[PDB]
Amino acid sequence: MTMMDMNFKYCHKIMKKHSKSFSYAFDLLPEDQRKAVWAIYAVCRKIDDSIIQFLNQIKEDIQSIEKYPYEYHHFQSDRRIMMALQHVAQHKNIAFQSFYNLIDTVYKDQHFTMFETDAELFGACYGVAGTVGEVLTPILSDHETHQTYDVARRLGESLQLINILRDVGEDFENERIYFSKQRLKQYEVDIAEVYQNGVNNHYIDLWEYYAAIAEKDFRDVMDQIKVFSIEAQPIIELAARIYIEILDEVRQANYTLHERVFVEKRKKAKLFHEINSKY
Ligand SMILES: CC(C)=CCC/C(C)=C/CC/C(C)=C/[C@@H]1[C@@H](COP(=O)(O)OP(=O)(O)O)[C@]1(C)CC/C=C(\C)CCC=C(C)C
Ligand SMILES: [Mg+2]
Ligand SMILES: [Mg+2]
């Protein structure tokens, strides 16, 4: 067990801590892609958790890795994570611009004021999650085309939308609402009121409006599953399927705004069995 192995095992532990659905799937990858995913995840985890000066420190670590992949650096932020990311960058082509976009998005979030329209909202989904799909693309496909990026991007954006749809209650408590002003007006919905009084029909309708968008994007990703390498196809499908099942869970908890619903480990294995057998 080397120095490097210790970095990756740390990244892995971050991933298992913060993301039960994605680790479950992505730990099924062959060892070398598995480790690249752990490392990208943990960098994005840390960027997302930044908050100020830690975030600039990370941005600086990333920029050194870009300009000088084969040199030793004295990383300012988290050395275990940065070392692993740099090890990954030596063997794979990484879209640095895509981590800067994510970093910009976390900086802008400081000044978050609700989205006027669905197009600002989809613009944020790109920034938090569409970028992650882009950074992962060369790890999960052997030939990167524009098509491969487009599919990875859309997968990530629709996972963010599913995340939003799950976290409606806890997001309100943290003073955030991600549904667009325009769509809240149209459906006559006020999130404060729902939170206090329970679900109603206007809410379900607005909710299901977005759920249908996420579902349509999901189905469009699945019909293009082929852009990914053969070993990653069933994993990616698992990861997406698990995340989509979050949608059925929300409806069975009656769209509650007072708990985080989840897909249990036993359900995860059942979906894996299903995908597995189709392959
Ligand atoms: C690198 C990796 C797997 C994840 C990166 C974790 C990142 C970027 C955090 C900073 C930005 C944020 C807030 C992202 C939200 C992730 C919710 O996870 P998390 O909050 O940890 O767990 P949960 O909320 O479920 O408990 C999100 C929904 C985007 C997931 C998009 C993916 C996976 C692209 C898939 C495309 C292909 C697989 C081609
Ligand atoms: Mg969330
Ligand atoms: Mg999240």
Coordinates of C-alpha atoms and ligand atoms in Angstrom, one line a residue:
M1 CA 0.0 0.0 0.0
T2 CA 1.8 3.1 -1.4
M3 CA 1.6 6.8 -0.8
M4 CA -0.6 7.2 -3.9
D5 CA -2.9 4.4 -2.8
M6 CA -3.4 6.3 0.5
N7 CA -4.5 9.4 -1.5
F8 CA -7.1 7.5 -3.5
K9 CA -8.5 5.7 -0.5
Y10 CA -9.0 9.1 1.1
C11 CA -10.9 10.3 -2.1
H12 CA -12.9 7.1 -2.0
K13 CA -13.8 7.7 1.7
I14 CA -15.0 11.2 0.8
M15 CA -17.1 9.7 -2.0
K16 CA -18.7 7.0 0.3
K17 CA -19.4 9.6 2.9
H18 CA -21.2 12.1 0.7
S19 CA -22.7 10.1 -2.1
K20 CA -24.2 6.6 -1.3
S21 CA -25.9 6.2 -4.8
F22 CA -22.9 7.2 -6.9
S23 CA -20.3 5.2 -4.9
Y24 CA -22.5 2.1 -5.0
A25 CA -22.4 2.3 -8.8
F26 CA -19.0 3.7 -9.5
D27 CA -17.1 1.3 -7.2
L28 CA -18.1 -1.4 -9.7
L29 CA -15.8 0.2 -12.3
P30 CA -12.5 -1.5 -13.1
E31 CA -9.8 -0.4 -10.6
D32 CA -8.2 2.3 -12.8
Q33 CA -11.4 4.1 -13.8
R34 CA -12.8 3.6 -10.3
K35 CA -9.8 5.6 -8.9
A36 CA -10.0 8.4 -11.4
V37 CA -13.7 8.8 -10.5
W38 CA -13.0 8.9 -6.7
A39 CA -10.4 11.7 -7.2
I40 CA -12.6 13.9 -9.5
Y41 CA -15.5 13.4 -7.1
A42 CA -13.5 14.5 -4.1
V43 CA -12.1 17.6 -5.9
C44 CA -15.6 18.6 -6.8
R45 CA -16.8 17.7 -3.3
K46 CA -14.3 20.1 -1.8
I47 CA -15.0 22.9 -4.3
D48 CA -18.7 22.5 -3.4
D49 CA -17.8 22.5 0.4
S50 CA -15.4 25.5 0.2
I51 CA -17.4 28.2 2.1
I52 CA -13.6 32.9 0.7
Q53 CA -10.0 31.8 0.7
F54 CA -10.1 28.0 0.6
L55 CA -11.8 28.1 -2.8
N56 CA -9.1 30.3 -4.4
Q57 CA -6.5 27.9 -2.9
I58 CA -8.2 25.0 -4.6
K59 CA -8.5 27.0 -7.8
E60 CA -4.7 27.7 -7.6
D61 CA -3.9 24.0 -7.0
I62 CA -6.0 23.1 -10.1
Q63 CA -4.3 25.7 -12.3
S64 CA -0.8 24.5 -11.3
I65 CA -1.8 20.9 -12.3
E66 CA -3.0 22.2 -15.7
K67 CA 0.1 24.3 -16.6
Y68 CA 2.7 21.8 -14.9
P69 CA 1.3 18.2 -14.8
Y70 CA 4.8 16.5 -14.4
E71 CA 6.2 18.9 -11.7
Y72 CA 6.1 18.7 -7.9
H73 CA 3.8 21.3 -6.3
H74 CA 3.3 22.5 -2.7
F75 CA -0.5 22.3 -2.8
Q76 CA -2.3 25.1 -0.8
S77 CA -5.6 23.2 -0.2
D78 CA -6.0 19.4 0.3
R79 CA -2.8 17.6 -0.6
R80 CA -4.2 14.0 -0.6
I81 CA -7.0 15.1 -3.1
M82 CA -4.7 17.3 -5.3
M83 CA -2.0 14.6 -5.6
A84 CA -4.5 12.1 -6.8
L85 CA -6.0 14.5 -9.3
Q86 CA -2.5 15.2 -10.6
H87 CA -1.8 11.5 -10.9
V88 CA -5.1 11.2 -12.9
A89 CA -4.1 14.1 -15.2
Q90 CA -0.8 12.5 -16.2
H91 CA -2.6 9.6 -17.8
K92 CA -5.9 11.1 -18.9
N93 CA -7.1 14.3 -20.7
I94 CA -9.0 16.4 -18.2
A95 CA -11.2 19.5 -19.1
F96 CA -9.8 22.0 -16.7
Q97 CA -12.2 24.7 -18.1
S98 CA -15.0 22.6 -16.6
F99 CA -13.6 22.7 -13.0
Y100 CA -13.2 26.6 -13.4
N101 CA -16.9 26.8 -14.4
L102 CA -17.9 24.8 -11.4
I103 CA -15.7 27.1 -9.3
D104 CA -17.4 30.2 -10.8
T105 CA -20.7 28.6 -10.0
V106 CA -19.8 28.2 -6.3
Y107 CA -18.5 31.7 -6.1
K108 CA -21.8 33.1 -7.7
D109 CA -23.9 31.1 -5.3
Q110 CA -22.8 33.4 -2.5
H111 CA -25.0 36.1 -4.1
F112 CA -27.9 33.7 -5.0
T113 CA -31.1 35.4 -5.9
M114 CA -33.9 33.1 -7.3
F115 CA -34.1 32.3 -10.9
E116 CA -36.5 34.4 -13.0
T117 CA -36.8 31.7 -15.6
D118 CA -36.3 28.0 -16.2
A119 CA -33.3 29.0 -18.5
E120 CA -31.3 30.6 -15.6
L121 CA -32.2 27.4 -13.6
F122 CA -30.9 25.1 -16.4
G123 CA -27.9 27.4 -16.6
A124 CA -27.1 26.6 -12.9
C125 CA -27.6 22.9 -13.4
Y126 CA -25.0 23.0 -16.1
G127 CA -22.6 24.9 -13.8
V128 CA -22.9 22.5 -10.8
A129 CA -23.3 19.2 -12.5
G130 CA -23.1 19.5 -16.3
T131 CA -19.5 20.4 -15.7
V132 CA -18.9 17.2 -13.7
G133 CA -20.2 15.0 -16.5
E134 CA -17.8 16.8 -18.8
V135 CA -14.8 16.2 -16.6
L136 CA -15.7 12.5 -16.3
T137 CA -16.1 12.0 -20.1
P138 CA -12.5 10.8 -20.9
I139 CA -12.5 8.5 -17.9
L140 CA -15.8 6.7 -19.0
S141 CA -15.3 6.5 -22.8
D142 CA -12.4 5.4 -24.9
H143 CA -13.1 7.8 -27.8
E144 CA -14.3 11.3 -26.9
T145 CA -16.5 13.0 -29.4
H146 CA -18.7 16.0 -29.2
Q147 CA -21.5 13.4 -28.8
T148 CA -19.9 11.9 -25.7
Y149 CA -19.6 15.3 -24.0
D150 CA -23.2 16.2 -24.9
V151 CA -24.5 13.0 -23.3
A152 CA -22.4 13.2 -20.2
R153 CA -23.5 16.9 -19.8
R154 CA -27.1 16.2 -20.1
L155 CA -26.8 13.2 -17.7
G156 CA -25.3 15.4 -15.1
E157 CA -27.8 18.2 -15.6
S158 CA -30.7 15.8 -15.1
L159 CA -29.2 14.3 -12.0
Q160 CA -29.0 17.9 -10.5
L161 CA -32.6 18.4 -11.4
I162 CA -33.5 15.1 -9.6
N163 CA -31.5 16.4 -6.6
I164 CA -33.4 19.7 -6.6
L165 CA -36.7 17.7 -6.7
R166 CA -35.7 15.6 -3.7
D167 CA -34.3 18.4 -1.5
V168 CA -37.2 20.9 -1.9
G169 CA -37.9 21.0 1.9
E170 CA -34.4 21.2 3.2
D171 CA -33.4 23.7 0.5
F172 CA -36.2 26.1 1.7
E173 CA -34.9 25.8 5.3
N174 CA -31.5 26.9 4.0
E175 CA -33.3 29.8 2.4
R176 CA -33.0 28.5 -1.2
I177 CA -35.6 27.8 -3.8
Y178 CA -34.6 26.5 -7.1
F179 CA -37.9 26.4 -8.9
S180 CA -38.1 29.5 -11.2
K181 CA -40.1 32.6 -10.3
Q182 CA -41.7 32.3 -13.7
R183 CA -42.8 28.7 -13.1
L184 CA -43.9 29.4 -9.5
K185 CA -46.2 32.3 -10.7
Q186 CA -47.6 30.2 -13.6
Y187 CA -48.6 27.3 -11.3
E188 CA -49.7 29.6 -8.5
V189 CA -47.2 28.1 -5.9
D190 CA -45.5 29.6 -2.9
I191 CA -42.9 27.4 -1.3
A192 CA -43.2 28.9 2.2
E193 CA -46.9 28.2 2.2
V194 CA -46.4 24.6 1.0
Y195 CA -43.7 24.0 3.6
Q196 CA -46.1 25.2 6.3
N197 CA -49.3 23.7 5.0
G198 CA -48.4 20.5 3.2
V199 CA -48.6 19.5 -0.4
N200 CA -51.4 20.6 -2.7
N201 CA -52.3 20.2 -6.4
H202 CA -50.5 23.3 -7.7
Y203 CA -47.3 22.0 -6.1
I204 CA -47.7 18.4 -7.4
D205 CA -48.2 19.9 -10.9
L206 CA -45.2 22.2 -10.7
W207 CA -43.1 19.3 -9.3
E208 CA -44.2 16.9 -11.9
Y209 CA -43.6 19.5 -14.6
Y210 CA -39.8 19.3 -13.7
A211 CA -39.8 15.6 -13.0
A212 CA -41.0 15.0 -16.6
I213 CA -38.1 17.1 -17.9
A214 CA -35.6 15.0 -15.8
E215 CA -37.2 11.8 -17.0
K216 CA -37.1 12.9 -20.7
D217 CA -33.4 13.8 -20.4
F218 CA -32.8 10.5 -18.6
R219 CA -34.4 8.5 -21.5
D220 CA -32.4 10.5 -24.0
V221 CA -29.2 9.6 -22.2
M222 CA -30.0 5.9 -22.0
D223 CA -30.7 5.7 -25.8
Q224 CA -27.2 7.1 -26.3
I225 CA -25.5 4.9 -23.6
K226 CA -23.3 3.6 -26.4
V227 CA -21.0 6.6 -26.4
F228 CA -19.4 5.2 -23.2
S229 CA -16.8 2.5 -22.9
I230 CA -18.2 -1.1 -22.6
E231 CA -17.2 -1.6 -19.0
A232 CA -18.9 1.8 -18.0
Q233 CA -22.2 1.5 -19.8
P234 CA -23.9 -0.7 -17.2
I235 CA -22.4 1.3 -14.4
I236 CA -23.6 4.6 -15.8
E237 CA -26.9 3.1 -16.4
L238 CA -27.0 1.8 -12.8
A239 CA -26.0 5.2 -11.4
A240 CA -28.7 7.0 -13.4
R241 CA -31.4 4.4 -12.7
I242 CA -30.7 4.6 -9.0
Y243 CA -30.9 8.4 -9.1
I244 CA -34.2 8.3 -11.1
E245 CA -35.8 5.9 -8.6
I246 CA -35.5 8.9 -6.2
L247 CA -38.4 10.3 -8.2
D248 CA -40.7 7.4 -7.4
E249 CA -39.6 7.6 -3.7
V250 CA -40.6 11.3 -3.5
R251 CA -44.1 10.4 -4.8
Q252 CA -44.5 7.5 -2.3
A253 CA -43.6 9.9 0.5
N254 CA -46.3 12.2 -0.9
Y255 CA -43.9 14.9 -2.0
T256 CA -43.0 15.6 1.6
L257 CA -41.0 18.8 2.3
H258 CA -39.9 17.5 5.8
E259 CA -37.6 14.6 5.1
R260 CA -34.9 13.4 2.7
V261 CA -36.2 10.3 0.9
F262 CA -33.6 7.7 -0.3
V263 CA -33.3 4.5 -2.3
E264 CA -32.3 1.7 0.0
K265 CA -29.2 -0.5 -0.5
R266 CA -31.5 -3.5 -1.2
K267 CA -33.3 -1.5 -4.0
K268 CA -29.9 -0.6 -5.4
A269 CA -28.9 -4.3 -5.7
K270 CA -32.3 -5.1 -7.3
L271 CA -31.7 -2.4 -10.0
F272 CA -28.2 -3.7 -10.4
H273 CA -29.5 -7.2 -10.9
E274 CA -31.9 -5.9 -13.6
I275 CA -29.3 -3.9 -15.5
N276 CA -26.8 -6.7 -15.1
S277 CA -29.1 -9.2 -16.7
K278 CA -29.8 -7.0 -19.7
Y279 CA -26.0 -7.1 -20.3
Ligands
LIG1 C1 -17.9 13.3 -9.7 C2 -19.2 12.8 -9.2 C3 -19.6 11.3 -9.5 C4 -20.0 13.6 -8.4 C5 -19.5 15.0 -8.1 C6 -20.1 15.6 -6.8 C7 -20.1 17.1 -7.0 C8 -19.8 17.7 -8.3 C9 -20.4 18.0 -6.1 C10 -20.4 19.5 -6.5 C11 -21.5 19.9 -7.4 C12 -22.8 19.3 -6.9 C13 -23.6 20.0 -5.9 C14 -23.2 18.1 -7.5 C15 -24.5 17.3 -7.2 C16 -24.1 15.8 -7.1 C17 -24.9 15.1 -6.0 O1 -24.0 14.3 -5.3 P1 -23.8 14.4 -3.7 O2 -24.3 15.8 -3.2 O3 -22.4 14.1 -3.4 O4 -24.7 13.2 -3.2 P2 -26.3 13.2 -2.9 O5 -26.7 14.6 -3.0 O6 -26.9 12.2 -3.8 O7 -26.3 12.6 -1.5 C18 -24.9 16.3 -8.3 C19 -26.3 15.8 -8.3 C20 -24.1 16.1 -9.7 C21 -23.8 14.7 -10.1 C22 -23.4 14.6 -11.6 C23 -22.7 13.5 -12.1 C24 -22.4 12.3 -11.2 C25 -22.4 13.5 -13.5 C26 -22.7 12.1 -14.1 C27 -22.2 11.9 -15.6 C28 -21.6 10.8 -16.0 C29 -21.5 9.6 -15.1 C30 -21.1 10.7 -17.4
MG2 MG -29.4 19.2 -3.1
MG3 MG -25.5 17.7 -3.7

